[PDB]
Amino acid sequence: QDSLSFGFPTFPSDQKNLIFQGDAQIKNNAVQLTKTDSNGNPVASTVGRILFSAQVHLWEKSSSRVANFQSQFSFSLKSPLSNGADGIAFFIAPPDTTIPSGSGGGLLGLFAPNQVIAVEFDTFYTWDPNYPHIGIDVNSIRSVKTVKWDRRDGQSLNVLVTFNPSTRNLDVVATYSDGTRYEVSYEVDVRSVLPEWVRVGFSAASGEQYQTHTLESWSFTSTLLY
Amino acid sequence: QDSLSFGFPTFPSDQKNLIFQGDAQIKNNAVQLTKTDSNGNPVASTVGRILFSAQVHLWEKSSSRVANFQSQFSFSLKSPLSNGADGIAFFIAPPDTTIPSGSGGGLLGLFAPNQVIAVEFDTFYAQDSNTWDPNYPHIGIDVNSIRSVKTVKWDRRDGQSLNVLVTFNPSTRNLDVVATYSDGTRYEVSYEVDVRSVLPEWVRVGFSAASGEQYQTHTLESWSFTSTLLYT
Numbered sequence A: 001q002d003s004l005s006f007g008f009p010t011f012p013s014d015q016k017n018l019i020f021q022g023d024a025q026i027k028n029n030a031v032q033l034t035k036t037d038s039n040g041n042p043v044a045s046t047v048g049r050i051l052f053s054a055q056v057h058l059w060e061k062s063s064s065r066v067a068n069f070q071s072q073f074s075f076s077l078k079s080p081l082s083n084g085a086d087g088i089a090f091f092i093a094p095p096d097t098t099i100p101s102g103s104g105g106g107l108l109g110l111f112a113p114n115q116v117i118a119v120e121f122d123t124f125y126t127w128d129p130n131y132p133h134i135g136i137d138v139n140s141i142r143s144v145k146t147v148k149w150d151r152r153d154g155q156s157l158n159v160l161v162t163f164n165p166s167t168r169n170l171d172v173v174a175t176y177s178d179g180t181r182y183e184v185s186y187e188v189d190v191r192s193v194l195p196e197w198v199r200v201g202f203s204a205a206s207g208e209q210y211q212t213h214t215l216e217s218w219s220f221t222s223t224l225l226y
Numbered sequence B: 001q002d003s004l005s006f007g008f009p010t011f012p013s014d015q016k017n018l019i020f021q022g023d024a025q026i027k028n029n030a031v032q033l034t035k036t037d038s039n040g041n042p043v044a045s046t047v048g049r050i051l052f053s054a055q056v057h058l059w060e061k062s063s064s065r066v067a068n069f070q071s072q073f074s075f076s077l078k079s080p081l082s083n084g085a086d087g088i089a090f091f092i093a094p095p096d097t098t099i100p101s102g103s104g105g106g107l108l109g110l111f112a113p114n115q116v117i118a119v120e121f122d123t124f125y126a127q128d129s130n131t132w133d134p135n136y137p138h139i140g141i142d143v144n145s146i147r148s149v150k151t152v153k154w155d156r157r158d159g160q161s162l163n164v165l166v167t168f169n170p171s172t173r174n175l176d177v178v179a180t181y182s183d184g185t186r187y188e189v190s191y192e193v194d195v196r197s198v199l200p201e202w203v204r205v206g207f208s209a210a211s212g213e214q215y216q217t218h219t220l221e222s223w224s225f226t227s228t229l230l231y232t
């Protein structure tokens, strides 16, 4: 299809179109990307991701078309620690993507110690190591562009990621319920790093430091344009 | 997802989200549900179907919600014969649905000699028709094991594309079918149906077609679909 869209106001346990990888699973009508014990508390050394089952036609060489897409989602991070880690990321990658061997901890279950575009929200220590940051990743280049961010335990962060094929601008806008806002954008020709068909989803991980990475909602739309 | 939408203005050969069953396959930027030879001509004894890969959440008991959906598509039938057969159908069924053994010919690859809702466009002659004039093609609505719970006379036009819009409103439970040729000739058939009484919560949507002794192409040219859960 030239156009595809789907919306998850919440994530009930009765899932059918999500490819769960690692420790990712549904709990409390939300996707708990990283493992949690019987009390719902985050544990160390855990990685998990999800991908929507239907593939997205990101661009088409024959028709010289590239897709305009938007991804809106909400998540919250909680931890008994004061330095919860490591982070959650929205990513786009080849359809058969799997958690790379040894990509736990700071590699967020996305990179091995390949083809992909990701927007990561890192809370652990191209950016000020002293504080959290939002980063845009392109292929093997992590944080080609970043912006300072603030972690707020248990507070949902609403995010909107948009891609305009005409300008090739990948825009990211994130806000907390009080209006605090973060934004970062970067020019990227999706045709130079990703195949025509891809899958979209989220990934998260925790090494020695931990926190829950709870994806609360997610909506997405994509349409090929001339 | 409570909502899902997708659109195929055409069907290029590099498909990823379609589940091809039987002889169904992509040829000339369209889905050829039934088999065709090297010259584009239809052959006898063939059945084929397609389903969109992502499952559709039709209803949810826990929230007392039912989906409002619409399916728009166009197809064309072509045959060197004077009586092409048998027909093409849009259908909704359990996710693991497969072609029933012996469902060729007049069974369209949908019924065995179950749980489903379908809108079939038949061109075959069945001297046992009890809800439509057998001497002429018909469009019929199928609910579970009841084929053609309601029908309307239709005309077969070789090689001409028929545009169809199928809509379901959970508030009224009306399943509306409107089909038109490029000249505006219109066919309408509608029926009340509580999808909750015939289909599971999650389903797959798609098309099916078959040719027995008589044959014709069943070319699906375009297809768009949208569904959203609503309280109720």
Ligand SMILES: OC[C@H]1O[C@H](O[C@H]2[C@@H](O)[C@H](O)[C@@H](CO)O[C@@H]2O)[C@@H](O)[C@@H](O)[C@@H]1O
Pocket (backbone or CB within 6 Å): A044, A045, A046, A085, A086, A102, A103, A104, A105, A106, A107, A124, A206, A207, A208, A209, A210
């Ligand atoms: O082997 C334990 C642990 O090692 C690695 O995690 C490290 C680092 O990547 C993380 O940022 C921090 C904070 O969580 O913890 C470690 O220092 C990863 O290989 C991880 O998968 C693993 O659990």
Ligand SMILES: OC[C@H]1O[C@H](O[C@H]2[C@@H](O)[C@H](O)[C@@H](CO)O[C@@H]2O)[C@@H](O)[C@@H](O)[C@@H]1O
Pocket (backbone or CB within 6 Å): B044, B045, B046, B085, B086, B102, B103, B104, B105, B106, B107, B124, B211, B212, B213, B214, B215
């Ligand atoms: O083996 C021949 C053919 O038989 C059956 O088709 C019959 C009937 O269902 C069709 O409506 C008419 C016209 O196409 O042809 C036969 O009479 C099916 O079993 C079919 O699969 C098979 O090829």
